[PDB]
């Protein structure tokens, strides 16, 4: 998702796609910057679409 | 004078094969297939050399 919508004292669900086995990226909601920081696991399905 | 039946371009049905079962394996995939007449398989890939 590209563009959300924030109100209030209130959560977001975001979806994305990495490449690496740790996701420690940058997030910017709307201006603010977050370290987003942990560990990914490998897929078990082999070959997608 | 006139040869007559020209080739017209026309529509016309050929046989859809059996669906293959596909068994997915790290970097590769199975073929199980089923054809009671032959049928042409082509693969390549996509990157740049296309086997």
Do not use: M, Y
Request: with cysteine.
């Amino acid at each position: 998702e590209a563009t959300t919508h924030v109100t209030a004292t209130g959560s977001i669900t975001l979806h994305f796609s990495t490449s690496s086995p740790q996701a420690n990226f940058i997030v910017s909601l709307c201006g603010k910057k977050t370290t987003c920081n942990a560990e990914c696991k490998p897929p078990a399905d082999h070959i997608i679409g | 004078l006139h040869i007559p039946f020209r080739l017209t371009p026309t529509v016309c049905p050929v046989p859809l094969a059996h669906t293959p079962t596909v068994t997915k394996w790290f970097k590769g995939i199975t073929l199980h297939l089923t054809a009671t007449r032959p049928t042409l398989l082509t693969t390549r890939k996509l990157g740049l050399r296309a086997d």
